[PDB]
C-alpha cells in the first residue's frame, strides 16, 4: 500500500491478524537524523523526498545501555532493544485497520524505561491487535534517551535539555499533519505511555507547544511529579559537567564543552552516563527532563498546582507491585532465583540502597510505617515491606497525587489498580504484579489464541482493550456489553477507582491512603528538617 | 542585540544580573515628539526609519516641576527625574530575559506621582531583576504629566484632555504590535502601576480603546475613584482658563487660547501650574484625567457602578501608612527631622490644610472619629491620627471601595495590605510604611545581595516578586513552593485580604471597616448638607 | 457639515442647544419614493447620487387623515403633521452630539398614532436634547401609515401587507450601513417607540429580518398583543375588498384590483379608509400589521409564547390614564370643555361605543368589575371607570402580559408606571396622565429653561432622560448619581415595577392585578361563549 505524506510517499505492508488484515508502516522518519552537528539539538524537520520510502521494517532503536544482569533471561531481555542502536534513530510506526478507515481515532504510544532506555519496536508494543480489534490507528515513535536525549546546559541552544521530549512532540506534529492521509482523525488523538512514557504524557499535558497535538491522555504507572521524573536546573547542569570531566571535556567557554562532547564516540558517552550521579539507586534517572523554558515554561509543580494544563479527560493507574522489579538490581538478600526472604537487617540496608542521602530519621520513619504488622513472624514480612516502600514512594503515591491535583480543576479522571499476574510471567511468584506487566494486556497480546495465555486472561485483556479504546474514542472507559459495574469518575473528595483483575473487578476508594499520607505529608516534613 | 519593530530596527544592550544576562532596550520611541504644533494634542504615530535606533540609554524624562523641599535628601530625591526634562519625551523601555523567550508574559509599568511628575527611569522601576528572576518581559513608558499631559478644553481637539493617558495607551498599542518580535506574548500582558499609575491602570480597565491592549491589572496604592484622581469637566475648563490668565493668554476665540499657550515657554507653563487651583493641598492634582468623551466615554463612577469595564482578575493593595508622606509638605508641627509630636490645635490646622473648603462640621466629624482612643496621653496620638485621616480618605478607602464594586460583577480580585518598613528608609520611624515604599520590593531591589537589605527583606521581596509574576502569568498570586497560607479571593461579602510582612503574613478581613464607613457614607452626607 | 453615506454625500446643519452644539441631518432619504407602480409594494432601495443632498429641513410627512375635532386646540393639533403630506415620504432624520463622537450609542424612534397617522417631525420627537444632554445619536424615520402602509392582499406581492413595517426595517438597515460614518455604534442601537411605535418595536423583536438591526428595545404605552395592534388574515383581506368596493375598484383578477387602486387619487383612498370596518371605535386600526409570512413568519401570539424572539433587555411602561384620551372622540357625556360627570346610563353607552360587537354579558361583566366602589355617590365614579376600562383593556394589561411572557425566557425586563401630569397639559384635569404625555419628558423637552415647565418637571425629565440613555448604553436603566431606590428587574413571579413621578418614585408590585386577571382570563372566557 502507498500513502502520500507531506514529505513524499511511503510504502507499507499487509499483516494478517485474526483472519483479517492490518496495514503496517514501520519506521517512517519524522525528523533529520540528529548526527554530527545536530547531536544534542532540538530535532530538525525533514525536507521532501522525490521517490518512495520503504516503511516495511522497524527502524534503529536509539542509543542506550543494555541490561546485562540476566543474560538469556526473557524477563529482562524482552525490554532490551531489538533492532540496531544508532543515533540515526528518529523514526515512527503506524498501524491502520483493515479497510482504510475514514476518520479513525488515534492512539499514540510513548514507551517507558526511566528515560535512559527503550524502543518502540518491542513485541509488547505491537499495535496490530489494537487496530484489528478496535479499529483504531496506533502510532508509536522512537525518541532519544539518556544524555543524547536529555543532556542539559540550562539555556544553551547547543544542549537545551528535553530533546527526547521534543522528539515526541515532533512526532505528534507529524500525526496532526499526516494522519488524515492514513484515515485518522487528527482531532481524536489519545496519548498513552508507561512508566517514563506516562511521565512524558503528563508533561505534554503541561507543555504549551504540545497543547493542540492530542485530545486525551492515558497514564500507566508514572507521572511527572514522581521522585524520579524531573531533574532540577542545578543537578542537570552539575551532571553535564561531571560528564565533561569523565570524558576529558571540561573547558572554559561553555559552548566548547558541547563541541568536544559532540565529537566523542556514542559509546564513550554511554559508558560514563552511569557515573555522573554520586550515589547509585536502581531508580536512577541520570539524564531526564528538566525545566528548560521551552518545552516546560515553569516548574511543573507550580503549573499543576495552578491548573495551568490541558483541560481534558485522563485515565491513570498503577500495578499491585510496582516496586518489586527494582529489588533485584542492588538490594541485598534479593534474587530472582530464591524466594528472597530477608531479615530486618537486610531490609534496613535495602533502605540505604534506595534512599542513599537520607537522615537516620527518614529511614527510621519509613521503617516504622511499613513494619507495623500482624507479625506471627511471616518470614516474608520484610521482603514484602521493601517492595511496597519502593512502589508506593515511586509510583503509586505520585500517581494518586497527580490525579487529585488534576481533577481539582474540573475534568474527569479515571483511576485503575491493575492486580493480575500474567500466567506467563518469567519472574518469580514473590515479585507479584510487576511494574511493566499490564502493557501486554493493554496491547491485546493475550487475545492471540496461539500464545499460552489463559481464557481468563483473554477475557481480561479484551475488556481492558475495549475500555482503553472507549476512552480514546469517547472519553469514557466503559465496557458496555459484557461488563457489570461501570467505571466511576475519580473526584478529589471520594477518590474512587476501579480494580482490574481476572476474578472480582470491584470499585474501591482511597487507594494506599495511610501510605500516601506518609509519603506526601509526613516524610517530606522529615526531609525538610535534616538540611 | 538587534530586533526589528514595525517602524525599523532597534539595538539594545546586554546587562549582567545575578550571574546571568538581561537584554535591555532603553528609550525606544513610540510616538512623534509632541513639540510645536503637536503640543497638547493626542500622540501621533511614528513613520518608518531606514537605519538602526540605538536604544541603549534612558531617554528624556518628561517636563515637570521638581521637588525642592529637601535638597540632597535621598528620601525625596529618589523620586525626582534622573535624565534631562524635554517635551521630546515619549519613549519606552523593555527588558528581556536571558535567552530570548518564546512567548513570555509581559509586565507593563505605569509610574505614579500625582500626574504632575515622575519618569520611567527611576532606579526603583528598574525591571532587570523581574526579567532575570521570573523570566518575564518588563516594559515601562514615559507619559506627559501636568498641563502638558492633561490640560483640557472640553471637546476642543486642540486640548481634549487625557493626553498622558493616550500616551500610555499608545505604548500599549506598541507592545501589541511589537512584543512578539522580542519574544513576548501579546495575549499575556499585565498592567501594574502605583499611586497615579494605579489610577491610570484602573482607567484602562474602563477605557474601551484600551480594552484589548492588556489582560490583567495590578493596582498599588491608588484607583480612579480616589478624591484626588479625576477632575470634573467644569474644574478642568476653569483651570485651563486660570492658566491662560496667569500667562497673558486669555482670548475670545477659544482655539486662539491654545495657540498662545502652544507658544509659551515650557518653563513658563510649569511655573503657573501650581497657581491655577484656589487653595493648596499637598494632594493637589492640578491637571489630571477628565471625562473627555474619547478615552473615557462617561463619568467613571457610573461606568464602575454598572459593570461596564474589562472583566478580568485584578490585584489591589495599599500600605500601612499611605498618609504620612504628605504631612511634611505643609502640615504645621511636622518635620522629617523631629518626631513631630503635635497638639490638638495643630491637628485641627492640619485638617484645614488637607480639607480646605470643608464645613466646620466635616472637620468636627473627622476629628471625632479619629480622636476616640485609649488616651493615656500618648503624646503621638494626634500625629498618628492625622496621618491615618489622610491615608484612609485618599488611598485606603477608595482602593477598598473600587475592589468591592469591581468584584460585584464576577471576577477574582485579590487585596493586599503591605505592612513592612524598609530597613533602608531615608524618612524617619514615625512616618512608618510610607506611600511609595512597596515598589522597591515588587521590583526585586532587595534581591541584590550587594545593597544593604536584610535577609528577611530578601525573603519578603522574593515572595512578592513571585506572587506578582504568578498573578501576571496565571491570574493567581500564589506562592506555591515556600508559602504557608495561600492568598484568598476578595469577595464583597467576606472581604478577605492578605498581609504582606517579614514576620506573620496573616489572612484578615474587612480592612479599616469603621474608617471606611465614615469616609464612604457618613462624611459624604455631611458634605451634601453644606452646599 | 458633510458626511458620505454609501449612496453619496449629505449636508447637515449646526443647531445650538444649551450653550453647545448638535449636528442635525433632517430628511435624508433611505428608499425610493413609493409612487406610481411602487405604491403598496415593499420599499425599494436607493441608487447612488453624484452630488450632495441638502439634509437641512424636515421632509414630507406621509399621507394620512388629519384630526379635525378641535380646530386650533394645541392638545390635538400637536399630534397633526407639520410638513406637507406626500406619498414621497420615506425620509429619516439624525442628530449627532457636539463634537462628532467616535462610537456613540444610537436611539431610533418609531412614532405612534394607531398606524393611521403620525410623522417624525413633531416638536415632541425632537432628538436634539438627547444628543446634547446624553451624547447619543438619535435617529427617527417616517413610515407609511393606513392603507398606503398596511393594505393587504394575503400573499399577493402587489400588496403583501406590513409595508410601513418594512419601511421601518429599511431605515434600520440604513443605520447599520451608515451610522458608522456619523460616529455611531452600529452594535449599540436601541429601538424606542410609543403607542403604535411601541407595538412596532415589539414586532421587530419577533421579526427575523429585523433581528440583527438593533440591540435593545424600549416600549412606551403599547405592544403587539394589544386588542388594537394586529389585524387577522381574514379581516385584512375583507377590508381590502370593502375599500375596492368603496372606490369602484372591485374586479375578478385580484391583481387588477391593485392596478385600479394604484391609480386612484391618494385623497380618494384616505377618504374611504374610515369606512371599511363595519362599526366605529375610537381605537379603530383600519389598516394595520398582519401576518404576512415575510416580516412576520407566524401568528405573533405563538411566537411570543414559544420564546421565538430576540433575546435582549427591554424597558416597558404605561401611563396612569391611557384611556381618557379616547373618551372625547365618541363617548356620550364627554367633552374636553366640561368636567364630564356621566350617569350609569351614559357609561353603559360608552361601553357600546368601545365594545361594539360584544354580548350583553361581556358588557355586564365589564360593568360589574369597574362598578364595585366606595360609592358615597362621588359624581365622577362612572367617568373614572370608563377611562380605566378603556386604558386597562387596551394598553396596560397587554403591556403587562407582554412583559410577563417575554421575561419568562430569561432576559431582564424593566417596567415603569408614569404618573405625572404635565403642568402645561392642554387637556383638562379630569383627563389625567394621558396617553402620549410621557414623550415630552423622554425627549427632554422640560430641560429647556425657556419653556414654562416647573423645576420639578425639569428634575423628572432629566432623571428619565438619564435612565433611558443608560438603558440604551448599558442595558440597565439606573440613575446612579442623584437617585435613591434603583430600578429592579421585572420577573414573572414577583412583578416589580418603578413609579415615575415628581414626588414619591416608589417600587411597587403587580400593577392592576385584579383588572388584568379580568381582561386576560375572565373576559376572554365570556367572549368565547357568545360565538
Swiss-Prot record, chains A, B, C:
E.C. no: 3.1.1.8
Reported effect, residue 304 to P: In BCHED; expressed at very low level
Covalent S-S links between cysteines: 62-89, 249-260, 397-516
Effect of residue 327 to I: In BCHED; BChE variant form; fluoride-resistant
Keyword Signal belongs to the record: yes
InterPro entries named in the record: AB_hydrolase_fold, AChE-related_enzymes, AChE_tetra, CarbesteraseB, Carboxylesterase_B_AS, Carboxylesterase_B_CS, Cholinesterase
Modulation of this protein's activity: Inhibited by mercury. Inhibited by Tabun. Tabun forms a covalent adduct with Ser-195 that becomes irreversible upon aging.
Keyword entries, A-Z: Disease variant, Disulfide bond, Glycoprotein, Hydrolase, Phosphoprotein, Secreted, Serine esterase, Sialic acid, Signal
Catalysis performed (reactions): an acylcholine + H2O = a carboxylate + choline + H(+)
Phenotype for residue 291 to M: Does not affect enzymatic activity
Assembly and binders: Homotetramer; disulfide-linked. Dimer of dimers.
Name used for this protein in its record: Cholinesterase
Gene: BCHE
